[PDB]
Every structure is written in structure tokens, then in C-alpha cells.
């Protein structure tokens, strides 16, 4: 059955073997008769199926046992063990669902959670359902963090996370079902328009895209086959490696051109010298002008010798003017890419800078895509009613203190205290005592200088250096709400090709949710940081000019409503999301996940998108990170 096999896959597990995490929790199983290993795997896979088939209701141990078939419904103890495991690690009974057995009246252990984004909310729900006392401290006047939906009238647009990157294996598939989140496929077709507004023809678009793919592939070869990862005692950036590959392509074009020029010059020299000898054989004919009868025959066989010598040379001439005009009619390219072509290629680079939220010259060549292996399957989807329905639903029933900005975290062998100020009256402060702190502060806030939050005692060097090495990027959006659709409704995406390499990320991509009279323009790469220093009105004006160039200056009305994100300037984010910087690696994500112990017991815990090696810079990654920490905290305090 790919019923039960599907459940494992859907939970990011192999259907047919135990994980190292399972091995640690079930040592007796992995070291015992392999027969009972299969039994374990079936129970695990089937319990997952029971949960995934109906994630709106709590799946209890009882109900699991009553739905298993003989003889598995007789493995009472093993079923309990598997159920307890799946629940603790948040593989079942996560997100938001109806409880069957209500929450324990008295609570055990106190946990403060810093930040009320998806990671914080996910962890809170887990810890609460485990019977712990949980309070979330949130600096904004709203939950959700980098999930941030603009709503006004019937305009909905996402200023933060917007895309569910495939459902196959994605825990957001469960959450989606739970909160009745309407999801829609993104059509792939993305026509590009040049700076002057003219469509890039199919032919040219496909050629350039192909070159982009070859260039990326080449850097991958250089990095992972030829091990070119360090230069002049500096780790190589992806940007740097792309520049090298491009330079080699240009050298090859120049070589082929030179070889061609040398063939032409050779042929021209041959022609010039054959003319010369044919001009001399002509002077030798001019000058050619014993019985009378034998002189005639003699000066006959003389010319026929000279003439079938010359006619012979007019033929080696013929095959040379031919070979020449074939050369000068079949040149190789004189450039690798034209000015125009390079601009279009820059569109593809801008697109990559968007995905990674940073200029390519900052990305680690070796590690930038270290998380490729863990991509989900299925089409990428958008959220029709706005992504914020997820954090809003996850907040239901939780103790969340809004407008409460944490400034100090103290942790000792005997417990912790967290100091926060009200962001509306920075006079009044609060002190919250607890057994454990879960820090979900964005990497951007952890990097902040001077610091936004003081840790007492200071975080150990192994942690701060990780914080310092890791990249934290930027990406912004301009939302344009119109009263009518003037664009093509069967297109979700279209691209604007900029005019310089440096500014390639400026308003390079426009996005529409179908029927919604809204366009989103993206600002990526070096442009992202710079354009935050421009007012909404000027940046809006620049969008309209681009759209006017494409659709006609008369087809584009003034927008009714606009919003512009400035993630870098936002004090509660300080950027958009992590990336693997040159000099960093996936190992730094693991370092970020590691709890601090002041043996004393661990007191300070870390969740957030920057703490999950396999799923960084995503909502699902934030969510999984929360589930992880909740599991570790409960293990520590509840056993
Ligand atoms: C603009 C933008 C776009 C995307 C994302 C982010 C942003 C900014 N994505 C990331 C996702 O949002 C984040 O990873 C998580 O939401 C982070 O959650 P965390 O819980 O880790 O962090 P938080 O910041 O939300 O919570 C922290 C809380 O702490 C509070 N706080 C700060 N300081 C405090 C103090 N002192 N005291 C108390 N509280 C304090 C803060 O207020 C905060 O609440 C994206 N994620 C996705 O899953 N999807 C998206 O769409 C992303 C994006 C990421 C790229 O990897 C993507 C874009 C695409 C895309 O466009 N692809 C398509 C191209 C066309 O073809 C189809 C596919 C794909 S993914 N976007
Ligand atoms: Mg190439
Ligand atoms: Mg420029």
C-alpha cells in the first residue's frame, strides 16, 4: 500500500527504514529481530496515515489502537510507544485541531517564547498541548512576523511569505487543510519586456535562459567536481564563480574569431600570390608570338603546354575565391552576448538574487543550494485569502503579549528571567520568570549592532560566530491596487528587464493573483536595500512608468491603494531571511539550533527559519523548527 507508504513520504520519512532519530528513541527495536522492525515501521506509517487522513481532530492512542487491524491492534505497548513518539516530535497532533481529551487543569513548568511568528506559534501550541505554561512575548501589534498580509477593502496582498513551495512532504499541507486556506497554482509562463517595453521574442528568451542554466551548471561543476572553493584564502562566492565562467566563454569567442580571421588572411595571401604568378604566366604568353611547318607545330605544343598550365591555375583560383566567400559568409559570433542579451541574462541573475534574498557575490559557491535535496514535490501555490490566516489561526487560545519588546534574557542554573518594555510606553517594563526561554528572534535581530537584546550571561563564542558568519538577506515588494485589470489575466508573472547589471533587481518581476486587480512588483538584490531609501510615491511612479512602457501610457490608471515593504529597515526583522554566506555552511544552521546550558540543565532554546538546516528561509521550516524545540523542551522538563 502506497496508502501507508504515502503517509511516511508525506511526513518526510523513508517508508521502509528507521531514521537515526527513531534508532535513538527505540534502541531495542533497531538492535532486535528485524521482523519487529517491519512491525514498528508499519505502525509508524499507519498512525501517520490516520493523522494525515483527518488532521482536524486529535488522534489519540486509544483511537489509533481501535483503527489498527489484527495482529497490530494486539501490540498495545509498541503502539503506545510509537504514538507517544510521533506526538512528542510533532508528526501527529500538530497545528490546529479539535481536542478529544481536554487540557490538564494544572500546568507543569513555565516557558517564555520570544516572538510570535510561525516558529513561536507552532512551538507554543505544542508546549501548551503537552501541559506546560506558555507565554509568548511579541514586539509588533500583530502575530505572524514575516507572514504579513495587507488587508483593506477587498484588497488582500502578502508583503512577506506568499508561496507554498509544493505540497508533497510539506507540513503546510496539513495546516492548509486545518485552517481552510485556499491555495492556487501559479502558471509558469513569464514573458519578459525590455527597458523600452518591447516583448522579448520566444527564440531569444529560450536561448538566454539556456545559457543561464549552462552557466549555473558550470559553477556547480567547478565547485563540486574540481573543488574550486577557496581563492586567496577567501571562500568563493557564486557571483565570483559566475564571473569566471563568463570570462572563459568570452575568451573562447575571441579565440574562435581569431582563428577565423587567420583563415581569411591565409586565403587572401594565397589569392594575392596566385594572381601574381598568373600575371607572369600572362607576360610569358604575350612574348610567345627547320621547316615552316615544323615551327608551327612546335609553337603549338609550346602554347598548349603553357595553356593547360594556366587553365590549371585558374581552377586552383576558382576553389579559393569560393573557399574565401564561404569563410566571410560564415563568421562565428563576434561577441558572447550582445548588450541586449547580457541585460536579459541579468534578469535571470536578478531572479536568482530574489530566491536567495541577496546579491550573488555574497552567496557561498559550495553551499548556497545545500538544501536542494529536501525540496517538496508538486506545483508551487499562492494563498488566495492571504497567508496571515495561518498565524492568526495558530494564535487561537494562546497567551500572547503584543507590543512587548524583549530587551534582556537572563538564564541561570536555577531558572530564567526575561525583561521586556512596552513599545507604546517605553517607561513601563515587565519581568517574566520561567524555567525555559525559547528565542525565535530573526537572525537579523541577533546580528544587530548595537544589540537589540542583551543575553546575561553573554552567548558563548561558538554561537555568536555562527550568527556573524550566516547571511541575512533582503527582498521587498511594492503593492499596486487598481480598480480594473489592464494586464493579461491568463498570466500570473511577467518580467521587466533592467538597464544595468547593478540595478537588475529593480522592479524586475510583476505578479498578479487571478481576478484580484492587484500587481506586486519585486525588488531584489542590491536594489532591495537601496530602494528602501525612496518614498512610496516615487517608487510607485517608477512602477507605473514601467507598466506604461509595456501596456501603453493610456491603459495604466493611478492605483487606488499602495503598500511598500521595507524589511531591512523593519526593527523587528532587519531583513527578509537567511542565506548561506560565503564562509558559512549548513553546519551554522545546526549551531543556531543548539540550546545553551549555563551538569546544569539547558535553559535557552532557539527556533526560527535560521535554525533548520534542511528547510531554511521558509514558513514550513519555521514551523518545523518550532515543533522540534517544543519536543526538546518537553523531553527536558516533562521527560
Ligand atoms: C518578503 C519575504 C518573502 C518571503 C519570505 C520572507 C519575506 C520577508 N519567506 C520566509 C518566511 O516568511 C520566514 O522564513 C518565516 O516566516 C520566518 O518565521 P520565524 O518564526 O522564523 O520568524 P518571524 O520573524 O516570523 O518571527 C519572529 C518574531 O519575533 C518578533 N520580534 C522581533 N524582535 C522581538 C523582540 N525584541 N521581542 C519580541 N518579539 C520580537 C518579530 O516581530 C516576529 O514576530 C518565504 N517563505 C515561504 O515559505 N514562502 C515565501 O513565499 C517566502 C520566500 C522565501 C524564499 O526562500 C519565497 C518566495 C518564492 C517565490 O516567489 N517563488 C515562486 C517564483 C515563481 O514561480 C513560482 C514560485 C518562493 S519561497 N517569501
Ligand atoms: Mg556555457
Ligand atoms: Mg546602476
From Swiss-Prot:
Q: Where in the cell is it found?
A: Nucleus; Chromosome
Organism domain of life: Eukaryota
UniProt entry tagged with the keyword Acetylation: yes
N6-acetyllysine PTM positions: 262-263, 266
Catalytic activity as recorded in UniProt = N(6),N(6)-dimethyl-L-lysyl(4)-[histone H3] + 2 A + 2 H2O = L-lysyl(4)-[histone H3] + 2 formaldehyde + 2 AH2
Q: Does the keyword Chloroplast apply?
A: no
Instruction: State the family named in the UniProt similarity comment for this chain.
Output: Belongs to the flavin monoamine oxidase family.
Which part of the complete protein is shown?
A: 172 to 831 of 852
Modifications made to the protein after synthesis: Acetylated by KAT8 in epithelial but not in mesenchymal cells, thereby regulating the epithelial-to-mesenchymal transition. Acetylation by KAT8 reduces KDM1A association with nucleosomes, thereby decreasing histone H3 demethylation, leading to transcription activatio of target genes. Polyubiquitinated by JADE2; which leads to its proteasomal degradation. Deubiquitinated by USP38; preventing it from degradation by the 26S proteasome.
Tissue specificity comment = Ubiquitously expressed.
**What EC number(s) are associated with this protein in UniProt?**
1.14.99.66
| Positions of the SWIRM domain | 4-103
Q: Where, if anywhere, are coiled coils annotated?
A: 258-330
Signal peptide residues on this chain, from the entry's feature table:
none
What name has this protein been given in UniProt? Answer: Lysine-specific histone demethylase 1A
> Which cofactor is recorded for it?
FAD
Q: What class of enzyme is it?
A: oxidoreductase
Single GO term (MF): nuclear androgen receptor binding
The covalently linked position for Glycyl lysine isopeptide (Lys-Gly) (interchain with G-Cter in ubiquitin), per the record, is 319
Provide the effect of residue 577 to A.
Strongly reduces demethylase activity
Phosphoserine: modified positions? 427
Record remark on domains: The SWIRM domain may act as an anchor site for a histone tail.
Q: What does this protein do?
A: Histone demethylase that can demethylate both 'Lys-4' (H3K4me) and 'Lys-9' (H3K9me) of histone H3, thereby acting as a coactivator or a corepressor, depending on the context. Acts by oxidizing the substrate by FAD to generate the corresponding imine that is subsequently hydrolyzed. Acts as a corepressor by mediating demethylation of H3K4me, a specific tag for epigenetic transcriptional activation. Demethylates both mono- (H3K4me1) and di-methylated (H3K4me2) H3K4me. May play a role in the repression of neuronal genes.
- Keyword list, A-Z: Acetylation, Chromatin regulator, Chromosome, Coiled coil, Cushing syndrome, Developmental protein, Disease variant, FAD, Flavoprotein, Isopeptide bond, Nucleus, Oxidoreductase, Phosphoprotein, Repressor, Transcription, Transcription regulation, Ubl conjugation
Glycyl lysine isopeptide (Lys-Gly) (interchain with G-Cter in SUMO2) cross-link, chain position(s): 272
| A Gene Ontology BP annotation from the UniProt entry | muscle cell development
Its activity is regulated as follows: The N-terminal sequences of INSM1 and SNAI1 compete with histone H3 for the same binding site and thereby inhibit histone demethylation (in vitro).
Amino acid at each position: 500500500s502506497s496508502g501507508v507508504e504515502g503517509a511516511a513520504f508525506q511526513s518526510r520519512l523513508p517508508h521502509d527504514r528507521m531514521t537515526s532519530q527513531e534508532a535513538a528513541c527505540f534502541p531495542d527495536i533497531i538492535s532486535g529481530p528485524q521482523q519487529t522492525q517491519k512491525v514498528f515501521l508499519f505502525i509508524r506509517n499507519r498512525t501517520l496515515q490516520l493523522w494525515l487522513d483527518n488532521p482536524k481532530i486529535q488522534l489519540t492512542f486509544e483511537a489509533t489502537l481501535q483503527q489498527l487491524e489484527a495482529p497490530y491492534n494486539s501490540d498495545t505497548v509498541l503502539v503506545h510507544r510509537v504514538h507517544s513518539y510521533l506526538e512528542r516530535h510533532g508528526l501527529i497532533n500538530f497545528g490546529i485541531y479539535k481536542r478529544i481529551k481536554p487540557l490538564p487543569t494544572k500546568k507543569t513548568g513555565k516557558v517564555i517564547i520570544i516572538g510570535s511568528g510561525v516558529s513561536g506559534l507552532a512551538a507554543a501550541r505544542q508546549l501548551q498541548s503537552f501541559g506546560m505554561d506558555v507565554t509568548l512575548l511579541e514586539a509588533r501589534d500583530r502575530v505572524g512576523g514575516r507572514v504579513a498580509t495587507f488587508r483593506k477593502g477587498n484588497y488582500v496582498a502578502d508583503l512577506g511569505a506568499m508561496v507554498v513551495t509544493g505540497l508533497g512532504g510539506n507540513p503546510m499541507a496539513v495546516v492548509s487543510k486545518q485552517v481552510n486556506m485556499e491555495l492556487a497554482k501559479i502558471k509558469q509562463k513569464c514573458p519578459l519586456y525590455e527597458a523600452n517595453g518591447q516583448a522579448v521574442p520566444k527564440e531569444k528568451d529560450e536561448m538566454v535562459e539556456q545559457e543561464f542554466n549552462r552557466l549555473l551548471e558550470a559553477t556547480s561543476y567547478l565547485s563540486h567536481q574540481l573543488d574550486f572553493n577557496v581563492l586567496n584564502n577567501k571562500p568563493v562566492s557564486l557571483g565570483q564563480a559566475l564571473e569566471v565562467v563568463i570570462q572563459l566563454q568570452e575568451k573562447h569567442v575571441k579565440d574562435e574569431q581569431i582563428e577565423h580571421w587567420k583563415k581569411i588572411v591565409k586565403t587572401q595571401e594565397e589569392l594575392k600570390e596566385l594572381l601574381n604568378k598568373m600575371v607572369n604566366l600572362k607576360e610569358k604568353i604575350k612574348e610567345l608570338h627547320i621547316t615552316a611547318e615544323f615551327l608551327v607545330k612546335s609553337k603549338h605544343r609550346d602554347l598548349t603546354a603553357l595553356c593547360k598550365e594556366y587553365d590549371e591555375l585558374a581552377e586552383t583560383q576558382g576553389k579559393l575565391e569560393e573557399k574565401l566567400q564561404e569563410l566571410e559568409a560564415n563568421p562565428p559570433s563576434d561577441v558572447y552576448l550582445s548588450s541586449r542579451d547580457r541585460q536579459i541574462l541579468d534578469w535571470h541573475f536578478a531572479n536568482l538574487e530574489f530566491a536567495n534574498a541577496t546579491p550573488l557575490s555574497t552567496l557561498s559557491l559550495k553551499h548556497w543550494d545545500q538544501d536542494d535535496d529536501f525540496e517538496f514535490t508538486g506545483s508551487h501555490l499562492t494563498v488566495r485569502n492571504g497567508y496571515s490566516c495561518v498565524p492568526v489561526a495558530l494564535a487561537e487560545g494562546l497567551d500572547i503579549k503584543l507590543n512587548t519588546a524583549v530587551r534582556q534574557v537572563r538564564y541561570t542554573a536555577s531558572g530564567c528571567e526575561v525583561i521586556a518594555v512596552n513599545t507604546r510606553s517605553t517607561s513601563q517594563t515587565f519581568i517574566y520568570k520561567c524555567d525555559a526561554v525559547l528565542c525565535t528572534l530573526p537572525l537579523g535581530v541577533l546580528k544587530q549592532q548595537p544589540p537589540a537584546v542583551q543575553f546575561v550571561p553573554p552567548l558563548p563564542e561558538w554561537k555568536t560566530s555562527a550568527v556573524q558568519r550566516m547571511g541575512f538577506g533582503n527582498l521587498n515588494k511594492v503593492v499596486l491596487c487598481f480598480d480594473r485589470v489592464f494586464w493579461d489575466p491568463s498570466v500570473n508573472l511577467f518580467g521587466h528587464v533592467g538597464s544595468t547589471t547593478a540595478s537588475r533587481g529593480e522592479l524586475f518581476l510583476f505578479w498578479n493573483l487571478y481576478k484580484a486587480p492587484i500587481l506586486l512588483a519585486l525588488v531584489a538584490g542590491e536594489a532591495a536595500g537601496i530602494m528602501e531609501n525612496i518614498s512610496d510615491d516615487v517608487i510607485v511612479g517608477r512602477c507605473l512608468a514601467i507598466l506604461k512602457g509595456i501596456f501603453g501610457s493610456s491603459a495604466v490608471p493611478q492605483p487606488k491603494e499602495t503598500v511598500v515593504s521595507r524589511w531591512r529597515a523593519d526593527p523587528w526583522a532587519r531583513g527578509s531571511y537567511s542565506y548561506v554566506a560565503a564562509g558559512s555552511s549548513g553546519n551554522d544552521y545546526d549551531l543556531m539550533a543548539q540550546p545553551i546550558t549555563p551538569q546544569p540543565i539547558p535553559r535557552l532554546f532557539f527556533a526560527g527559519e535560521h535554525t533548520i538546516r534542511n528547510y531554511p528561509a521558509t514558513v514550513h521550516g519555521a514551523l518545523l523548527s518550532g515543533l522540534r524545540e517544543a519536543g526538546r523542551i518537553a523531553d527536558q522538563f516533562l521527560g
